[PDB]
Point group: D3
């Protein structure tokens, strides 16, 4: 089975499009899904090899039942709201995700235009975010973002559905959350205090030693070990976005994994806390305003 | 006199920020203007040589009178509304323009963040547009955009104030207009009908012959000769922008010239027409929602303030 | 595991196509060169890496094969078959060896071509030499993006490389070449919309026409073939423009690779002889074939071990 | 005065087009000349900044009098044939030159297509050459080619007409010659013997010292001093070309100068020799098969027709 | 199953070679660093991706292996073997750990080397540090292209990575290093043709000399070795120039990776001890070895599992 | 017009600094090389254009000038003046000739240095050789962006090039070099905020600290100098990191160019001897100077006419 381009090369621009399917829009949606790979080639081919254009398409739990009969992916369910003592992860509506990436925003925009052109009248937009990465892979908090992502074979094993759900092998599960940051509060911390929040050095991106790293730092809470002592990993492609005039400074979080359990365990640790940590300290500077879960099928499933 | 970076190399990303100065905000604004070149170097220097970051700062007619106590530039006035039989060019408020360009949007965003950080509490944002160019220099209508801009010495002559206003030599005048397109109506035209609107071939960007090019084409109406028969020229750096969810497809127009009279003559021809043409056909698919005029001083004028 | 030649190359913007016939008594000289051609490719190319992207694919025709080698023949190797349609003809022309040379720059192609022909002088007669160049946005001489639906990755390997069905020749491929000359004056008299109906895709945006509007005699419709089981039958193309402005020669050099020549030959039959619904491929009303040849491109190790 | 792009950045591809103007063709030609800068922008602008497309347009002596009335450039005359004791510099016909340069051959070809499309039925092609430079600035003989070209203000002074002919300021003079090489004979020399022909080291491109450099080497014979003791300089953009099937391996020579007398003095030294040198040794491996001289006007002269 | 270190790297234009010995009592500090070296690589390199191309290959010598680890040894791990030829000598010098650091720029190499040695200060003693740079056309200090006949793709994996013959250490490799200093004055007194007879390839074009003219004591002849079964025995080299103009030091840093040290050692024996037809490799009359060490480079997961 | 050497070079990522002394009897050989150095620069660099950006700036010290030339001397040429502060010392060390070689890659620097030293062998003795590399975001070994406030364009030409004040030497410049070694262990014991107070700029974003927070003994405060007439006195710097990981040597090679040595020397006096408000530059508590030399860099035509 041929996967979608979940494992993409590094890209400096992205568009995230989340829509809901209107009553009676099902047929139009199914037609577009069968064409989205051809649209990706049409927009991208003439800008190769620098364009690096890809589109990953996902389908929500409620939408799946409206579009398809027969088997469901084993782990597909609606995003679960988490109501912590201090911080909340909200659930927001979304039936379809288009995660569009390239080396330039114009290519993302051209593909997004063709997709939405085909769906007009059949869907309602819920969210549209145009992301850009800083030139040294830093996010809006000023930390390098992506460093511990798995690569090569380890990435395939962490991200792609396999023999545990063989009809849907080559798929993946995506969790998205849009975060807005309190930059005034963040810039009031010393650099060393910021390092204790994240769990890595700011300028050099070296992980703090185990003797200094706080238990409520972001890296400590999002490190999870499996039954056998292996690291359970996800693949992230977080993107900054925002608007200077409205004072909106954001991180758009997207995490891919072979089962949603990994990502959801990380989120529970962050928002509900553990015995040793009240919550993830990154959340004292970051508010989640969307939350959705999608299954991203193998490419050949869509081509039918 | 050292000009600001009006004549920039080609860039693929831009931010246009237009603000108004709140009552009592004048001193904070003057301070920022004296530091804006230093901020540009701080954000940009470490991303050289590929970043190509620049900021051009412009000041409106009413803002000028509030900020500075001596001489005014000879051509500085508020944008003049044009009320045509069919189409209107509106005037909208704006005291400061920051025209920020680079090879990537993140550099534009970082400089815009530092600028607005210093101005918080002294200004109110009126417009913010994040622009991106298509990879073959096309605009939202699918035509190459920029081709007949002047270059080298001819660009300097067309854009920079000289001896005619010597205390402001090295400055320029910018007009901005944000345009929204009706893409559904545009895409219902045949390609040949689109070419008759613009005045150039779509795929190859070759200008149509004088025998076929209509009088109400964009290129015909924006071609102006002077008293002496010489071409009057401006320098444009138009940028696409929009939002696919809201069906917003735009062109952000910006034109620089040594005197606003050149730009204003072009706009009069477009909106009010001539003997041979009712109006520029591009306006049947393009609506202006902003309009403002600014003077962009020489860099040393900004540096030497308190 | 048998190592293929570089049939699946990265994108290249320059090519030289060299077709020669083996003179009487030239066989030994040719066999010696074939055993050295991979080493010549490395010699010319290694010092220009990683940007040079130099490769050479070497092919051998049906009649030449019997003169050079004893033992087994590849199952699908035969002379190119002439197709004599009601209006258009696909000619067959002589060729014993093909050198398909590709790089990011023409000079690298030329240096490799010079070393190869230097070794073969006196043993071969040149039949065709074409210097090809791709336009900067992957467009061909007709102004359409060319290569978009080529297969990639595993699907390309499956469509192109001989496997278990002919195990002695696994890792080989079959190449068909045809040099085409265009009537550019007639082509440019069509509207863009009418050109799109010839090809089956939009010209500017390269989006395929919807199934309800795509004509039955468009290029894309006639070259879309399904197998017995309903799977798409695919080939890998690397078509190149060529020409001479002084002689008014504007061309496309067609080269198609496939695991069996049956796929390519079925597409050619549909183009030239037509179907129930289509007289012929409308691209042929603006394109004349003046060469036609078929070659087997062995696995690299087969050439080395002789 | 705005010059044409005689002083171009380094380019790896070129097309040279030489044509003659047919009976009745003058009006069609004048129209094209007034549009050629706009054609260059149309083809090139959308491929910027990597394309680096330019076109330099030249006009021959005879053609000038057919196209324009009034003043002539002071140094414009037909190419002068040189019949040396061993080697000959031929003159061949040419009314118009288009020297098209870019980073890629497809862009050169697209501009050449638009130009010749406009001229069809008014001109006859005499020569068409598609040139490519080797990736380390080498020519067909394997030597770095271009090294001692002038740059900056020294280039402007060597190439552009100034006050000496003020109506034609910003123009230049181009000489072209297509050369075919005997590559078999060249490659039979040792590297050291090839270095003595050129006057520079082959791998490192360091000039041989004056005590070792022979008097009949290419660099010695093309080094010329003026009345004042100053170096007389030209700007060259030589390009390889060829066809492997026809065994055609060439250099297309093009040299620009403020007056043709500089280039002509170099040609006399190469073909007729000096007191100490019979001829340029490069000519024992290089045969000229074309030769033409053109004036390349300032850009505004063409625009104002 | 086993993930190799980045032995098969893309081409890189900068390198740092660091050889150290482990001081008495330094073993625990070293084991801790080895378990973190891949994390340090990501920390320095991720923010310069994708163009940085930073990698570190870590090797362990024979005597150090016994100090660090209990249990199985790699089958081919032994101390470098000194070769005492009639004229030329290959010396053995001390070295417990190798860090072979490569990237597209030297500053990335330097930053990673700084982090590594920061962790090891007080536990190791440096024996050699070389900063290498490539010439722009892949040439070495002798003016010849260097790397041409390296294997690529599948053939490289087969020649370099330990497999089923030593399954506990599958995905590992063996590295031999030698630092060479050249007598450039003697070399530059040769004619080019005499230099070509030393190396066995043409200098400007890098084409191999024919079998009839290539001397038996040329570098290429002596380092071409066939196995019992007739197959070529291959290694992967990434030689780097280095030097200091003021001290007249012009060097080649040799590093050769292979699946077993026997291949590399057979080449070294032929170079230094000769054959029946060749006293020694002529390259050694202009090149003196001043270091010599052998290391095993484990699979990446073996290092992580500490 | 006198043609300057390439003091105002584009940004380069690699450098070699070579300082030598002229041996007794070496004068003639040196004069010959000086007349050829521009020719050697073109020979090494032309074949790597346009990306190579190779340049060489040649300087001559005070004592060497009097050995090589007769007649008039540049007005400000004297030996480097040792500064003996209460805590910190700026040493003077020997040097007759400077070669400041810059390019986009180290191999071009190295090849030109090799040809220069080849011609001078036997006539000079090397005193210092440093191979410099820039970090990818223009940072120095202290982790701060280095070069941000250099002057550019016309302002740089005015700050650097000799003019009418010394008309026989117009187009020349004065270069001061100092090699600094840093105590990185002490430096990394400071917090980031304490480091920012040493330099006078924010570390990550390179924004200058406000005048109300910037200490009087910060690097930026002490190296900001105004003239009697209120003008900023500026120099042009091209500082390069260098080092050796095994010896724990981390350095900055300082080079500053100015139209008169008085500007540079005033900055050095403020740093080493202090002012009324500041004992010394706090950067010197983590930075030791181990060389110090002053050279005059003549106009290019002065060197050619020898
Ligand atoms: C909706 C807004 C606009 C769009 C999409 C647009 C687009 C274009 C295009 C595609 C061209 C042809 C290629 C080129 O030379 O750039 C052009 C030319 C031009 N436009 Fe616009 N334009 C717009 C508004 C304006 C306005 C408001 C002005 C003046 C106030 C203006 C002045 C010009 C000029 C002077 C030219 C060059 C004509 C010549 O000399 O050939 N444009 N524009
Ligand atoms: C004058 C010669 C030719 C020209 C200019 C040409 C041009 C094109 C163009 C523009 C496309 C559409 C974009 C793309 O997918 O590449 C195309 C598609 C294709 N052409 Fe050609 N073509 C030529 C000859 C041939 C010949 C001789 C064959 C087969 C024997 C062939 C087979 C194909 C195929 C299979 C496709 C892909 C159809 C699909 O599956 O969508 N073409 N060609
Ligand atoms: C037959 C084909 C020609 C070839 C292959 C050729 C090749 C070269 C080479 C390799 C160099 C040394 C590098 C350089 O400075 O560019 C050179 C220099 C030069 N060539 Fe040629 N050349 C040819 C024809 C001509 C002609 C016809 C002229 C003058 C009419 C000419 C004038 C020069 C000049 C002036 C130099 C610079 C000499 C100096 O000042 O150092 N060349 N040429
Ligand atoms: C002074 C040290 C060295 C220099 C400057 C040097 C240089 C070269 C050069 C220039 C080539 C030809 C182009 C190529 O294939 O890379 C070559 C090939 C080769 N060298 Fe070296 N070499 C050195 C030492 C060694 C050593 C010590 C070994 C083995 C232990 C070795 C093994 C090889 C091999 C295997 C080849 C490829 C031969 C073939 O199959 O064509 N070299 N070397
Ligand atoms: C000891 C090692 C040195 C280091 C690491 C160093 C580092 C820096 C840094 C990080 C900056 C701020 C960014 C910038 O504008 O460049 C700077 C500025 C400066 N440095 Fe240095 N520097 C050193 C030595 C010197 C010396 C010896 C001088 C002068 C004699 C000097 C003169 C300057 C000047 C003039 C500025 C710009 C001040 C302004 O904003 O106007 N530096 N230096």
């Amino acid at each position: 089975p041929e996967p979608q381009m979940v494992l993409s090369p590094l890209t400096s621009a992205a568009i995230f499009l989340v829509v809901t399917i209107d009553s009676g829009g099902e047929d139009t949606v199914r037609d577009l899904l069968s064409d989205v790979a051809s649209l990706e080639r049409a927009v991208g081919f003439r800008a190769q090899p620098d364009g690096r254009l890809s589109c990953v398409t996902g389908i929500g739990s409620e939408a799946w039942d409206r579009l398809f009969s027969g088997a469901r992916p084993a782990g597909l369910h609606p995003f679960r709201e988490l109501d912590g003592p201090v911080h909340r992860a909200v659930a927001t509506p979304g039936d379809l995700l288009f995660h569009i990436r390239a080396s330039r925003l114009d290519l993302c925009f051209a593909l997004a235009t063709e997709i939405m052109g085909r769906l007009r009248g059949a869907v309602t937009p819920q969210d549209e975010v145009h992301g850009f990465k800083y030139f040294d892979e830093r996010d809006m908090l000023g930390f390098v973002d992506g460093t511990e992502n798995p690569t090569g074979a380890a990435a395939r094993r962490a991200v792609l559905v396999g023999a545990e759900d063989p009809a849907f092998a080559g798929g993946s599960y995506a969790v998205v959350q849009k975060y807005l940051h309190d930059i005034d509060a963040w810039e009031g911390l010393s650099v060393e205090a910021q390092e204790r929040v994240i769990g890595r050095r700011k300028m050099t991106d070296v992980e703090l030693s185990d003797d200094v790293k706080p238990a409520d730092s972001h890296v400590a809470l999002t490190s999870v070990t499996g039954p056998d002592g292996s690291d359970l990993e996800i693949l992230r492609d977080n993107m900054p976005f925002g608007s200077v005039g409205r004072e909106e400074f954001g991180t758009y979080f997207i995490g891919y994994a072979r089962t949603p359990e990994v990502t959801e365990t990380m989120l529970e640790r962050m928002f509900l806390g553990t015995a040793s940590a009240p919550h993830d300290r990154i959340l004292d500077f970051s508010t989640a305003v969307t939350g959705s879960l999608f299954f991203t099928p193998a490419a050949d499933f869509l081509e039918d």
